[PDB]
Amino acid sequence: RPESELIRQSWRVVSRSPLEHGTVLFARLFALEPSLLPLFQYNGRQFSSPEDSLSSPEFLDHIRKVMLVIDAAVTNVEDLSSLEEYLTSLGRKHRAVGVRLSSFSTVGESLLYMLEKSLGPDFTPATRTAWSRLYGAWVQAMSRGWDG
Numbered sequence: 625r626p627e628s629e630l631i632r633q634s635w636r637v638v639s640r641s642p643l644e645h646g647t648v649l650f651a652r653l654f655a656l657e658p659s660l661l662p663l664f665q666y667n668g669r670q671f672s673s674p675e676d677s678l679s680s681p682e683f684l685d686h687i688r689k690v691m692l693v694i695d696a697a698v699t700n701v702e703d704l705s706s707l708e709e710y711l712t713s714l715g716r717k718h719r720a721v722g723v724r725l726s727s728f729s730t731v732g733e734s735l736l737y738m739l740e741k742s743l744g745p746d747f748t749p750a751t752r753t754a755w756s757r758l759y760g761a762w763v764q765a766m767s768r769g770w771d772g
């Protein structure tokens with residue numbers, strides 16, 4: 625696919641600094657949906673503000689985890705059938721920690737936002753569309769986690 629090379633190419637720049645870029649993703653995500661903040665409970669504590677999350681080693685570790693799962697999507701983009709079982713469970717894990725499936729659309733918008741801001745001019749409509757199909761496929765995988 626050429627869809628698959630646009631993903632690879634765009635991913636390369638952000639994948640070099642996953643925490644920086646993942647930090648953009650989650651700052652955006654919290655700006656769009658503040659109610660996600662309380663879902664990250666480390667040490668039984670709740671973050672009061674979005675910026676509290678950025679001081680938390682566990683939250684930042686979660687940013688690294690997120691970027692690794694996305695990087696696995698990019699590597700396996702040509703088929704992606706392959707990650708179906710892993711993603712189904714990851715989806716269930718999130719159902720368990722309290723995430724609504726619908727929240728993953730906001731996640732998608734944050735990812736696209738982060739890519740757009742990092743790529744600027746380079747983020748062509750072909751690229752936006754490729755990433756939307758990829759993520760749409762990804763979230764379909766995950767949605768199995770919700771017993772659906």
Ligand code: HEM
Nearest residue numbers: 660663664665682686689690693694717721723727728731
């Ligand atoms: C609505 C957005 C999200 C919320 C509220 C959320 C929250 C959480 C929480 C509370 C945990 C358990 C604590 C931890 O492991 O740090 C977790 C685990 C994890 N998350 Fe997320 N998460 C979100 C999105 C994502 C996304 C988009 C990805 C990847 C694309 C991801 C990847 C992971 C991974 C790999 C784990 C470890 C699960 C395990 O191995 O047990 N998360 N998430």
